[PDB]
Amino acid sequence: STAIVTNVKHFGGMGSALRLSEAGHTVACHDESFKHQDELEAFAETYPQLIPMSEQEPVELIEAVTSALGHVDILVSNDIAPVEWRPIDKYAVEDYRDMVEALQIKPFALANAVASQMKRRKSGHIIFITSAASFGPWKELSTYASARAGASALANALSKELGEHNIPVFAIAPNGVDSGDSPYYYPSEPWKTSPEHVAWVRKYTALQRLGTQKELGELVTFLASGSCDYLTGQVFWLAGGFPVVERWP
Amino acid sequence: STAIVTNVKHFGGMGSALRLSEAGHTVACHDESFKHQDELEAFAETYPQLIPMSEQEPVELIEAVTSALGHVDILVSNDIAPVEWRPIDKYAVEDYRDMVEALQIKPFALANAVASQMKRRKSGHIIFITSAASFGPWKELSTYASARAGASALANALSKELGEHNIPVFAIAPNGVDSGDSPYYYPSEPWKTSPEHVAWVRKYTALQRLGTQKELGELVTFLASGSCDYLTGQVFWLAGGFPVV
Amino acid sequence: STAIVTNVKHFGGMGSALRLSEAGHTVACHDESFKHQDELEAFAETYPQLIPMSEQEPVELIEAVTSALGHVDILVSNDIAPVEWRPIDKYAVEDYRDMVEALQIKPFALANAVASQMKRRKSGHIIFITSAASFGPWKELSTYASARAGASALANALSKELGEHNIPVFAIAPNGVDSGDSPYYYPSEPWKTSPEHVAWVRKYTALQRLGTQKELGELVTFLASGSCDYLTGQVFWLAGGFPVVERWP
Amino acid sequence: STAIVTNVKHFGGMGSALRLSEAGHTVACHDESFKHQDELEAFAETYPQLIPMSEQEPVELIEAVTSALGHVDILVSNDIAPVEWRPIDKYAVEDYRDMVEALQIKPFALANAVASQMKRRKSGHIIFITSAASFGPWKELSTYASARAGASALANALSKELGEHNIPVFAIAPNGVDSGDSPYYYPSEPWKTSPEHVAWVRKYTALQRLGTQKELGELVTFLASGSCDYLTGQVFWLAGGFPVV
Ligand SMILES: CCOC(=O)C[C@H](O)CC#N
Numbered sequence: 001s002t003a004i005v006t007n008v009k010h011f012g013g014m015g016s017a018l019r020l021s022e023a024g025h026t027v028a029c030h031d032e033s034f035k036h037q038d039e040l041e042a043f044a045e046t047y048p049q050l051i052p053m054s055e056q057e058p059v060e061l062i063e064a065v066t067s068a069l070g071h072v073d074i075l076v077s078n079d080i081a082p083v084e085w086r087p088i089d090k091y092a093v094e095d096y097r098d099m100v101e102a103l104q105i106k107p108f109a110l111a112n113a114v115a116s117q118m119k120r121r122k123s124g125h126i127i128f129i130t131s132a133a134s135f136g137p138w139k140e141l142s143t144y145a146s147a148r149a150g151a152s153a154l155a156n157a158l159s160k161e162l163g164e165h166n167i168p169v170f171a172i173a174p175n176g177v178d179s180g181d182s183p184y185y186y187p188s189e190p191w192k193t194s195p196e197h198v199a200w201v202r203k204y205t206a207l208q209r210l211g212t213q214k215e216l217g218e219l220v221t222f223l224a225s226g227s228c229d230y231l232t233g234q235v236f237w238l239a240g241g242f243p244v245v246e247r248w249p
Numbered sequence: 250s251t252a253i254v255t256n257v258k259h260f261g262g263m264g265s266a267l268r269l270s271e272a273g274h275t276v277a278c279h280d281e282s283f284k285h286q287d288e289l290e291a292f293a294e295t296y297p298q299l300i301p302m303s304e305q306e307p308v309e310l311i312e313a314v315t316s317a318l319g320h321v322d323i324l325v326s327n328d329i330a331p332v333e334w335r336p337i338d339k340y341a342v343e344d345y346r347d348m349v350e351a352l353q354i355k356p357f358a359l360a361n362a363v364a365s366q367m368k369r370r371k372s373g374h375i376i377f378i379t380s381a382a383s384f385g386p387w388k389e390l391s392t393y394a395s396a397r398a399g400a401s402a403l404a405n406a407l408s409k410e411l412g413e414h415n416i417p418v419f420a421i422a423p424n425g426v427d428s429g430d431s432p433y434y435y436p437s438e439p440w441k442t443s444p445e446h447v448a449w450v451r452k453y454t455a456l457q458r459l460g461t462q463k464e465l466g467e468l469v470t471f472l473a474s475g476s477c478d479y480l481t482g483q484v485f486w487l488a489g490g491f492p493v494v
Numbered sequence: 495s496t497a498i499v500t501n502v503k504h505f506g507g508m509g510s511a512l513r514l515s516e517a518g519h520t521v522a523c524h525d526e527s528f529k530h531q532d533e534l535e536a537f538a539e540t541y542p543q544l545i546p547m548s549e550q551e552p553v554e555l556i557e558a559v560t561s562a563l564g565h566v567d568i569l570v571s572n573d574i575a576p577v578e579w580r581p582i583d584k585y586a587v588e589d590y591r592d593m594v595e596a597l598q599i600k601p602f603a604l605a606n607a608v609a610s611q612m613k614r615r616k617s618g619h620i621i622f623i624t625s626a627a628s629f630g631p632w633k634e635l636s637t638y639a640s641a642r643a644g645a646s647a648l649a650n651a652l653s654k655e656l657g658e659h660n661i662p663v664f665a666i667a668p669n670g671v672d673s674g675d676s677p678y679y680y681p682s683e684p685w686k687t688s689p690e691h692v693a694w695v696r697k698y699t700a701l702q703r704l705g706t707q708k709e710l711g712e713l714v715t716f717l718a719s720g721s722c723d724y725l726t727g728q729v730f731w732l733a734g735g736f737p738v739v740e741r742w743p
Numbered sequence: 744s745t746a747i748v749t750n751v752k753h754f755g756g757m758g759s760a761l762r763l764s765e766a767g768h769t770v771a772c773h774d775e776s777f778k779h780q781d782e783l784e785a786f787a788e789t790y791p792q793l794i795p796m797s798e799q800e801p802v803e804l805i806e807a808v809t810s811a812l813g814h815v816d817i818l819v820s821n822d823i824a825p826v827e828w829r830p831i832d833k834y835a836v837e838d839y840r841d842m843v844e845a846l847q848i849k850p851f852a853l854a855n856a857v858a859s860q861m862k863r864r865k866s867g868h869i870i871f872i873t874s875a876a877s878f879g880p881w882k883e884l885s886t887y888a889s890a891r892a893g894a895s896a897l898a899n900a901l902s903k904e905l906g907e908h909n910i911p912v913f914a915i916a917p918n919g920v921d922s923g924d925s926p927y928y929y930p931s932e933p934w935k936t937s938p939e940h941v942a943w944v945r946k947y948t949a950l951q952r953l954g955t956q957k958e959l960g961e962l963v964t965f966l967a968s969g970s971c972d973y974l975t976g977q978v979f980w981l982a983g984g985f986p987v988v
Pocket residue numbers: 083130131132133138141174175176177178185186
């Protein structure tokens with residue numbers, strides 16, 4: 001079993017890669033910083049179980065992995081963009097097109113690049129990492145919440161055509177997952193150290209804590225194992241019960 | 250009260266434009282065919298209570314309506330694109346982009362173009378016509394279902410920020426709505442006439458029939474009326490109960 | 495067209511009755527207080543357009559209305575119970591059975607009592623008034639949120655069998671609808687006068703205000719008019735955008 | 744780690760009990776047939792790693808497990824009732840009550856009976872097995888679909904208060920899961936053997952097959968493991984993609 005995890009330094013990247021690899025997948029990793037050989041080889045050295053790739057674009061990346069490693073069994077599309085908290089009327093149309101490019105077009109392109117090989121052998125798994133923002137409580141996140149919805153609905157829709165070929169498709173919609181040094185989307189500073197951030201979390205999530213990288217990695221790996229292919233199409237709300245609101249004053 | 254309905258000859262266009270008009274709104278209309286003065290004039294003669302514009306892109310359409318009728322109270326973004334049933338590996342990436350542009354970037358642009366003047370007047374209603382295909386039963390409809398889902402979520406997201414400025418936002422997600430001569434998406438031929446289509450509609454929908462332009466128009470007109478602003482954010486599933494098994 | 499509205503003094507009762515009647519329905523009204531003729535006739539006097547009934551139980555009530563007025567076209571099941579904000583382990587099983595009796599069994603019994611006459615003439619509308627609590631943000635409302643869900647799912651399920659008979663079925667799930675002198679569920683004191691209650695509302699709803707009885711009545715009446723039978727099965731979230739949560743600290 | 748699985752011979756019972764056991768939980772089992780020492784003993788011989796109880800009602804079942812194995816870490820409320828396809832006007836009101844009691848009051852009672860000891864230990868997992876029939880495509884299933892929806896919402900509601908005490912709550916809503924000899928709800932005869940059933944499953948579900956007890960059991964065991972507590976509140980749609988059109 002060979003896996004691709006994208007943007008491996010951010011968001012759900014490391015949880016996914018590290019846990020897939022503990023389980024025994026062979027894990028090829030994409031990141032933007034891997035443009036640079038200095039960065040690539042420092043990651044390889046830091047994590048000798050993982051296989052970093054330099055390729056950046058979807059068709060590029062799939063083919064390199066296929067040639068180097070024989071075929072792609074598991075695709076984890078771990079998509080990122082910075083959130084821009086503007087009122088609607090202060091965006092340009094181009095800003096949404098960029099957001100949609102990074103969050104919705106991307107996972108479609110990776111799924112387009114890899115499907116035919118997966119269909120041909122009647123096996124594969126496909127996992128999009130999206131966001132609990134999809135139909136959520138926030139305001140002034142309109143470009144971000146909607147693009148994430150497009151992505152979650154894509155996974156569900158793909159699940160229905162790819163069933164005949166024995167290929168499960170899933171979407172994982174997180175909130176409040178600790179991201180360590182990564183700014184996407186809950187870095188340990190400030191979320192783990194600033195007393196207000198710590199309090200906001202305790203207020204508004206049912207479990208009263210951040211979720212861990214391990215919990216997200218454990219999920220990606222459960223879905224990829226083939227123990228429960230029958231859940232195909234599921235959007236998973238990986239949000240620790242967020243939001244909760246307290247009883248009336 | 251001034252309204253804009255886009256792509257007026259297709260999908261929920263006529264339903265929406267005609268009902269708004271009966272209700273006393275001044276309804277400006279957009280459509281691709283109004284590029285051609287020829288077609289525009291034919292429309293205006295047939296529909297003296299509607300006012301068809303030639304303008305095609307969102308900002309010029311909004312500016313032109315604003316300048317000739319003096320402020321948009323109501324936007325109905327009636328969005329359409331040719332659905333092509335294909336398996337995921339047979340599409341060009343560029344085909345998804347085109348489909349997202351017509352079904353998803355376009356309602357954003359129209360909202361983006363009208364939002365600041367509605368906030369200033371603290372008054373307005375915004376309606377996206379999307380689709381019941383979002384998270385639906387279909388296969389090989391992946392581009393369409395997902396683009397339409399993006400558009401529905403956009404309506405919900407905007408309702409949340411625009412509430413504060415007294416501006417309700419809605420999506421209407423149809424299936425099986427009669428589109429007359431238009432092929433977007435259930436044209437009278439064949440859906441009303443071919444025995445085998447009539448029976449498919451009768452089997453997989455609860456009311457056992459197609460929805461009408463009057464039903465669609467009546468919903469748009471109620472939403473826009475100011476009578477039930479407190480539904481803001483809602484996705485209405487206009488599908489007569491589809492599917493049934 | 496003849497309508498029944500239940501518990502007419504509470505919740506969505508008056509909005510429903512008054513607006514149905516403005517539209518030209520003949521409106522028969524049920525309330526618990528109508529047990530007492532003193533209360534009945536004061537309501538009749540106060541509102542001469544409306545027809546109060548004394549009957550309390552579903553079979554009882556339907557038959558009286560049918561005999562007095564010829565047939566029932568529109569059923570508005572406007573169901574109430576006091577919410578009890580306990581932790582789960584502090585309920586008795588009986589407390590949930592009571593809640594389920596008042597919120598879920600009741601609307602089923604009224605729909606059971608009236609269906610056959612509606613099926614026979616191939617016309618009718620059925621409206622349950624439930625609650626946005628159904629899958630909501632609250633805690634320690636567990637008996638209340640779930641019973642309301644049972645009721646909303648009932649409406650949807652009934653819509654699918656009653657389509658062949660041209661009978662639309664809907665569920666209206668409110669939050670924060672001003673209820674005047676009624677304690678179910680947002681009385682004007684304190685919600686309209688106490689500065690904290692007013693503030694909580696501004697914090698957490700998108701429109702930053704209570705919803706009105708008129709807005710709810712306008713909806714029941716729109717659905718009953720037959721202008722848009724094609725929405726059958728809809729659960730309407732009549733909650734003014736609740737909940738919203740502010741940007742990160 | 745101690746678990747309880749109810750109605751163990753039906754629906755998701757064996758899936759759940761057997762997988763939990765393989766994972767090192769001590770699994771107590773309940774079932775109507777364990778009224779009769781006869782049947783209980785036959786079960787215990789066949790399944791030496793499972794421990795069947797005779798107790799029938801929620802509080803005695805919980806007390807008896809607590810006293811013989813010393814604290815319930817895991818509740819799996821595997822709920823069942825005979826579905827009778829009838830139109831709304833043909834049911835007795837009392838038939839809805841019975842259906843609500845078995846599918847909805849029962850998981851409440853079991854949760855109600857175990858919650859305080861889990862809060863004290865700040866440790867526990869609670870899983871309801873419900874149904875994909877909630878807001879589904881079926882007609883004349885009104886009592887069943889609604890009772891199951893009540894049960895699913897109960898899981899979500901409890902997750903919200905029990906979070907604070909470190910106790911995750913879940914529902915699993917199945918369709919088309921092989922139930923072996925059990926008639927709740929897809930027995931091997933006929934669903935595995937009759938040509939016409941095999942083809943219906945093949946047509947209306949995306950994976951074109953029935954789910955297995957191993958798949959169900961693997962989900963329960965993952966949820967209960969402590970590995971992904973942050974999903975708490977989730978309704979898992981275990982339906983292989985049903986329906987498709
Ligand atoms: C705008 C706040 O961010 C989120 O909603 C969640 C984020 O997208 C994913 C995580 N963790």
